[PDB]
Amino acid sequence: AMSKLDRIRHFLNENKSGLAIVSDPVTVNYLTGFDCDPHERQMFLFVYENREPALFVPALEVARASSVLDFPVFGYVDSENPWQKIKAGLASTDIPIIYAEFDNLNVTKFQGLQTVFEGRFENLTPFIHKMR
Ligand code: NA
Ligand code: NA
Numbered sequence: 001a002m003s004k005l006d007r008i009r010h011f012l013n014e015n016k017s018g019l020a021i022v023s024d025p026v027t028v029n030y031l032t033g034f035d036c037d038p039h040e041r042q043m044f045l046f047v048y049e050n051r052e053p054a055l056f057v058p059a060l061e062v063a064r065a066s067s068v069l070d071f072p073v074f075g076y077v078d079s080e081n082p083w084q085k086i087k088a089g090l091a092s093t094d095i096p097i098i099y100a101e102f103d104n105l106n107v108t109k110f111q112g113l114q115t116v117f118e119g120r121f122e123n124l125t126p127f128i129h130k131m132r
Pocket of ligand 2: 113114115116117118119
């Protein structure tokens with residue numbers, strides 16, 4: 001009955017978190033069936049506890065992602081600041097507890113996410129391993 005995104009949302013809800021930020025391309029593909037290596041660019045899947053998800057990708061990937069996902073996809077061209085684009089595109093960025101994949105995120109991306117999101121980050125990686 002439960003989809004993989006349903007399982008993420010159940011986990012968030014159990015742990016009083018409004019949002020998971022999924023960054024590992026392997027996890028994005030696992031959860032959604034969209035397979036993308038962003039290389040050095042930004043990709044994040046935003047799995048809200050009680051809203052539809054959104055995927056943020058380089059602009060080049062928006063058409064393909066949109067063709068295989070049934071929730072909103074948005075992106076950025078290289079002349080745009082991706083942190084500003086995320087902030088402008090997401091309605092909700094004040095979430096007290098946010099889950100993210102600490103084994104995947106580098107400190108640079110973590111610092112970027114911290115410029116967008118007001119809240120405390122917790123580690124999603126153990127749950128992702130448990131799912132698989
Ligand atoms: Na779509
Ligand atoms: Na912050």
